Amino acid sequence: MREIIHISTGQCGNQIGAAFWETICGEHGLDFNGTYHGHDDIQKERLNVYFNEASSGKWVPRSINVDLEPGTIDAVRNSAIGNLFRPDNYIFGQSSAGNVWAKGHYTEGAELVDSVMDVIRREAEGCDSLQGFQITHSLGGGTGSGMGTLLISKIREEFPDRMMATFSVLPSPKTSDTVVEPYNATLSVHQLVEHSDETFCIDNEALYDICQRTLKLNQPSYGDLNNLVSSVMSGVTTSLRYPGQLNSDLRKLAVNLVPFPRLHFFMVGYAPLTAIGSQSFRSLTVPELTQQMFDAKNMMAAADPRNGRYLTVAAFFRGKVSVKEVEDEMHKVQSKNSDYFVEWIPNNVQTAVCSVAPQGLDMAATFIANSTSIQELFKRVGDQFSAMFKRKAFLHWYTSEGMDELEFSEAESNMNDLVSEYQQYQE
Amino acid sequence: MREVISINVGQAGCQIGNACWELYSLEHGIKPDGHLEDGLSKPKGGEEGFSTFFHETGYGKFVPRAIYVDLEPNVIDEVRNGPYKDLFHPEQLISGKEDAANNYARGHYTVGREILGDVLDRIRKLADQCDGLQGFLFTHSLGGGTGSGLGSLLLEELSAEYGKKSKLEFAVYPAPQVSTSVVEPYNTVLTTHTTLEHADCTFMVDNEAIYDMCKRNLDIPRPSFANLNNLIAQVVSSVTASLRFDGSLNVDLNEFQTNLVPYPRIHFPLVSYSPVLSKSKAFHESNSVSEITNACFEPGNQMVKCDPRDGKYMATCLLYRGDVVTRDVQRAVEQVKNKKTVQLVDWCPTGFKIGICYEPPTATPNSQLATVDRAVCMLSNTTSIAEAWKRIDRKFDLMYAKRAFVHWYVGEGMEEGEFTEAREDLAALERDYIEVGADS
Amino acid sequence: MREVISINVGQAGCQIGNACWELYSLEHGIKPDGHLEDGLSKPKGGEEGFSTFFHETGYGKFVPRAIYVDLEPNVIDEVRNGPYKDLFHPEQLISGKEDAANNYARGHYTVGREILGDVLDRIRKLADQCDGLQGFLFTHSLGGGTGSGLGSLLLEELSAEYGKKSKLEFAVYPAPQVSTSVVEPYNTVLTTHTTLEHADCTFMVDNEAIYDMCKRNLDIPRPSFANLNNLIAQVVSSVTASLRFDGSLNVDLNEFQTNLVPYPRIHFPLVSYSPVLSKSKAFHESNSVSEITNACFEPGNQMVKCDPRDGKYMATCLLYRGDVVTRDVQRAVEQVKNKKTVQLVDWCPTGFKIGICYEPPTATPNSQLATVDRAVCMLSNTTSIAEAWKRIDRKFDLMYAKRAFVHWYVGEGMEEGEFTEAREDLAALERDYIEVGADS
Question: What topology is assigned to C270-384 in CATH?
C-alpha cells in the first residue's frame, strides 16, 4: 500500500510536477536513458511507487498530466528529464479554459474529463498498491482552479476510501495579476473545502522574501521556487518510502494533524534555509534546524506566528539523527514556547524519522502545523470581495453561463464558518 | 508446562525482540545463524532447557519460536534481509501489506480480526509442535497503536483459548513528560481495561528512565534505542535467570503469582536491574549486594518517573546471579528494613523472596554495560505508579474536555461510553492502589 | 568508627589534597595510578588500616574516598587530565559550571544549597559503602570565598546529619600582613560563627609563616605554593601518624578532644612541625628532641604571625616518630618547664601528652625537606592567636566604618545585623581567650 499517482494540472502545476520529477529522479538515482543507478536495494523496491516496469528493464512514470494548452509538454519532452513519460500520459486539448471559473469546468471542462476518468480507472486496475493522490494546481489560475475541483469530485466519487492531498498555490492578497484571480480562488475553495481532506498554504511572495533574505537571489526565477517546493514535497513522504523510528503516512497526517475534516489548512515551513557562501560557516544540527523551524520568517503561509497561537505542530525529520537530540530540543521548545501552544493537547507534537539524507544537503526537515493565522488571509479575501465586487463590474462574464448570487453568498457563509472554526480554537 | 511462546507487536517490540534473541544467541553460544556453532553445554539443551525458547530441530538446529505480526512490511523486510532470516521460520513472519493508520484507529476493530484467525491457527500449530505449554511473553509498545491494538486482541484471544497459562506482558509505556504522538494515551488506556481483565503479570518499562540512566550511569551523550533494547533485553533475560541455568534455589514462573499476587487483584510488579556501570567505571567499583539493592531502590533505576520510596510496601522478589552469599543478602535486607523504608503491610507481613543463580551476569557487547560478577533483578508490586496513572488521567481529563478525537472514534463505530468506562476503570484501579496499602 | 572522609573545597584546598594524596601514595607504596604497584605491608591494609582513607576495592585497587566540590571547572579539569584520574571515582568529582563570584557572595546563600542535596546524598552513599564512620577532614581556604562558603555550608549540614563524629578542619587563613583580596576577612569571619557553633577541632595555618620558613629554613629564594602544600601535607599526615602505623603508645582521635578540650569552650589548637632543614644542611645537624621542641616553640615554626611564648599555657600534645627515647623526652619537657615558659594553668595543672610512633618520619621528593630519623609534631591550644584575631577585628572596624560592601551584601538578602553579631561573637571569643588564662 505505497504506490502514488501524481496528477498534474494548470500552468504552474505542470512546472511544479516536472520539477518534482527531476528531484525524484535525482534523489533516488535514475538516468533518462534507462540506466539503473540505485544503491542498493531500498532504492529499487521504493521506485515502484512512482514508476512501473516496462519492457527491457525500463521504468516509466504513472502520472496523468492534463492541460488545455499543449505548449508545456514541448518544454518537457525535449527539455530536462521528462523523456520517460509515455506518449499516452499526454492528455491535452485546445485551447484554454479562459482563465475563469465559469468556463473552466462548468460547461466546456466536462468534455475530455470523462476520458481522464477512464484513464484514471485503467491506471487503477494497472496499479496494485494505490495509496494516495497528489495534485498540483493554482488556486487563482483558470485551468487549475477550473477542472481541479471537478477532478477532486470524481476522485471522491470513484474512491470513497482514499484520501485526497491538495497543494494549491494561494495567491497573495496584495498582488493582482488579474481582477478575478481571488474570484476564481474562492469559487474553487467553495468546493475544495467540501471535497478535500488536507491542503498546504503556498504563497509565491513568501518564496520571494526567503530568496531575498537567505538566498540573496538576483534573478526572480520560478525554477528555484519549484525546486524548493519539490524538495519539501519529497521530504513529506521520505518517512513513508524510507523506514525510520516512526514512519508517517498521509492518513497519519489526517488522524493526528487534522483536528477535523472541515479544518484542513496547513502552513509549510522548510529547513535548512541556507545558500551558497554560508555552507562552510554553519554547523547543520537539529537545534539550528529547530530555530529555523519556529522562526517567524521561514514559513510560506505567509503570516505572523507569534501574534497568534498554534493548535498542533509536527516535525518530519530526515537523515542520520539520534533520538535524544530531537526529543531534547522538543523539551526545550515546549518549555520556552509553552504560551503559544493550545492548553488542551497539551503537547502539540508529531515526530517522524527518515533514514536517507536529503539530496544536496546533510540534514533537513519539513514543518506542518495548524494556527489561527489563516482566517486573516480569508477575511482579507472576503474584504476584497466586499469592496470590489459590490459594483458588479465585469461580473456578467460568469452570470452569462447561469451563475447565481446564491453561490457567492454561500461561499461567503463558508468562509465565515471557516473563521468561526478558527475561533473555537480561539486565537 | 515446558515451553514459552513469545510474540512481538510493533516496531519497538520487534527491535526489543531482535536485541533479546541476539543476547540469547550470545550467552547460549548460538552463532548469529544457528547450527550451531558450536554447542556449549550441558546445560543448554540438552538437557532441557533448551528447548525453552529455541526449538530443537531434529537436524540439530536451534529455531526461536516467535511470531512477528505487524501491518507495516518495513520491519519484516528489515528482519528478513539481515542475519535474523536463519532464526525465524518463514511462516512465522506474518508480513502485513495494509497501511491506513498507526494503528489503533483500525487495529482494535474489525480490520484486524480477519487476520487474527491465521495468527491463532499458526500459534495453535506451534503449540501442537512442542510438548506442553507454560506461558507467553509479550513485547509491544503502548505508544505505537499497532502494539496496543494487536497485542490486546491477541490477549483476549489467547485468554479465551486456554485461560490457564501465565501471561507476561513487557509493554513499553509512553513517556510521562512528553508523548511522541498525541493518540498514545488512548492506545494505552483503551486497552488498560482489557489488560486488567485478561492479564496475569504485566511489567512496566519507561523509555525516559532508560535514557536518564544512559545519560547519567552510562555517561552516553546520545543514547540510542538499541541501547534501551539491549538493557531491557538483559532485564528480560535475567528472570528467566534460573529457568535456563542451574541454581541452588531456582525460581518458578508460577511462584511469582503465588507470592506476589495473593488476590484476584493488582498484579503489576515493577522491575529494576543493577549494578549499572560503564566499561571505564569497572576499575573503581567492587561493591556488595547492599549497594546494588540501594541502587535498585533509587527512582532512576526503577524504569518509572516516580518515587518508589514514597509508596507502601508490597511483596517483592530478589533474584541474584553470580557469586552471592545468603548471609550477606540476609544482612542487606535486614539493614534495608532497619532504614525504615516503604511502610510494611500487615498481611504478608514481611516477605522477601530470594533467588540464587549460579551463572554469572552477562552483558551485551553492543551496549556499554561492563560485565559484573554479581547482579540484582528486583521485582516488586509497589503502589508508587499510582501518581503516574494519575498524571496520565489528568492529561486524559484535559484532552477529553473537548474529546479531540471522538469524531473519528465514533465514525468507525465507537462512542463516548467506552471512554467513560475506561476512565472509571482507571479511577477504580487508582482507588484500589490507595486502599491495598491503606488497609494496613 | 573506622573510616575518615576528607572533603576539599577551593583551589587551594584542592592543591593541598593533591599533595597529601601524592604523599599517601608515596609512603604506603601505591603507584600514582594504583593497583598496586605493588603492595608493601603488613601493616598497610591488610591489616586495617587501610582502609582508613583509601577504599579497599574488591579487585585489589586502592581508591581515595574524597569529594571534590567546586563551582570552578578548571580545578576539576586539572585533576581529571593528570594522574589523579585513576584515584578518584568519577561521581565523586563534582564539577561546577556556574561562575558569578569567587565565591562567598553567593556561596553561603540560596545559590549553593540546591547543589548541596546531591553532595549530601553522595556522602551518605559513601558512608553506607564503608563499615562505620570516625571523623571528617576539611581542607579549604578562608581567602577564597568558595572554600569559606561551601565548607561552612557542609559544616552545618553534616553537623545536623550526625552530630556525633569528630570534625577536623584544616582552614587556610588569609595572611595578616596583607590580603590577596579585600573580601577575604568577610569570608573568614562571617563563617567564624558557624565554625564556633559547628566544629570540634580546627587547625590554623598561615601561608606567610610557611613562606618565611621556606625563605629562612629551606633557603629557597622563590617558594612555591606546591612547597607549602607538601609541608602542610606532612603536617597533616603526621597526626594521623599512629592511625596507620604501629606504635608503642598509639594516640586516638577522640583523645585529642578528651584532653585538649575539657569544656564546651575553645577547641582550636595550634600545630607545629620540626625539624625543618634542607638537603644540604643534613650533613651538620643530628640534634636531639630538646632542640626540635625548642624549634617548635619558635614563633616562625608555629604557622601563625604571633608570639606563642607570650601567651598562657594550655594542654598540649607531643607526637614523636622514628627513634625516640621516653627518658630523653621526659628530660626535655622537664627542662622546658624549668625555663619558665608560658604560664602554667592550675586546672590541668601540667599535662604533656606524649605520643610515640615506630615509623620513621617521611619527606616529599618534590619538597626540599631532608629525611630525618626523628620528628616532632606539637599540638597546643595556646591563646596566642588572640592578638591575631584582634588585628583582623581592627581591620574589620576600620573597613566597617564605611562598611564598603553592604550594598551587595544587603542586595542579595543580608543586613548589618549579621555583621554586628559576628563582631560581638569575635569579641566574646577574644574575651574568653583572655579569661581562660586569667582565671588561673
Answer: 60s Ribosomal Protein L30; Chain: A; (3.30.1330)
Question: Least CB-CB distance to C59: which of B219, B280, B286?
Answer: B286
B249: cell is: 534455589
Q: Which residues of C line the annotated binding site for Mg(2+)?
A: 72
Does the beta carbon of B71 lie under 8 angstroms from any beta carbon of chain A?
Answer: no
CA dist B231 and B235 (Å) reads 6
How far lies B213's CA from each of A330, B272, B277, B319, C262, in Å? Answer: 20, 12, 10, 21, 51
- Pick A260-373's CATH classification: 3.30.1330.20, 3.40.50.10490, 3.40.50.10800, 3.40.50.720: 3.30.1330.20
**Residues 6+ away with beta carbon under 8 Å from B127:** B3, B5, B133
Q: Chain C closest CA to B106's CA: distance in Å?
A: 48
- Domain topology for B385-438: Helix Hairpins (1.10.287)
Beta carbons within 10 angstroms of residue B59's beta carbon = 6
Separation in Å, CA of C59 to nearest CA in chain B: 7
Beta-ladder partners of C318? C354, C378
Residues B379 and B256 sit within 8 Å (Cβ to Cβ): yes
Locate A64 and state its grid cell.
496523468
- Report DSSP state, residue C37: S
Q: Nearest C-alpha of chain B: how many angstroms from A95? A: 40
Laid out side by side, the sheet with B352-357 consists of B270-274, B374-380, B316-322, B352-357
Within chain A, all domains assigned CATH 3.40.50.1440 are found at: 1-259
Method of determination used here: cryo-EM
Tell if the CB–CB gap between B294 and C128 is shorter than 8 Å.
Answer: yes
Buried b (16+ CB within 10 A) or exposed e, A388-408: bbeeeeebeebeeeebeeeeb
The x, y and z cell numbers of residue C15, run together, are: 592543591
Please tell me whether residue B410 adopts helix, strand or coil conformation: helix
3-class SS of residue C251: coil
Distance (Å, whole) CA C72 – CA C62: 27
CATH architecture of A1-259: 3-Layer(aba) Sandwich (3.40)
> And the C-alpha cell for A275?
545558500
Distance CA A222, CA B40 (A): 68
Residue numbers of B annotated as active site: 255
| Sequence-ordered list of residues with C-beta below 8 angstroms from that of A360, at least 6 positions apart, any chain | none
Which residues on chain B place their C-beta less than 8 Å from a C-beta of chain C?
Answer: 219, 280-281, 283-287, 290-291, 294
Q: Which of B100, B178, B398 is nearest residue A344 as measured by Cβ atoms?
A: B398
Rounded to whole angstroms, the maximal C-alpha distance in chain C is 63
Nearest to C353 by CA among C326, C314, C318: C318
Give phi and psi for C205, each to the nearest 5: -130, 135
Instruction: Find out whether A239 and A2 touch, Cβ atoms under 8 Å.
Output: no
Q: Is B381 assigned to a binding site? A: no
Annotated catalytic residues of C are 255
Q: Please name which of A355, A351, A377, A356 lies closest in space to residue A366, comparing C-alpha atoms.
A: A351
Pick C1-269's CATH classification: 3.20.20.140, 3.40.50.1440, 2.70.150.10, 3.40.50.2000.
3.40.50.1440
Cα-Cα-Cα-Cα dihedral of B362, B365, B369, B373, to 10°?
30
Q: Which of A246, A337, A421 to substitute to test the interface with B, most B CBs within 10 Å?
A: A246
For residue C358, count CB atoms less than 10 angstroms from its CB and return exposed for 0-12, middle for 13-18, buried for 19 or more: middle
| SS3 per residue for A130-174 | EEEEEEECECCCHHHHHHHHHHHHHHHHHCCCCCCEECCECCCCC
Q: What is the amino acid identity at position A41?
A: D
**Which chains border C (3 or more CB–CB pairs < 8 Å)?**
B
| Bridge partners, residue A367, by sequence | A269, A315
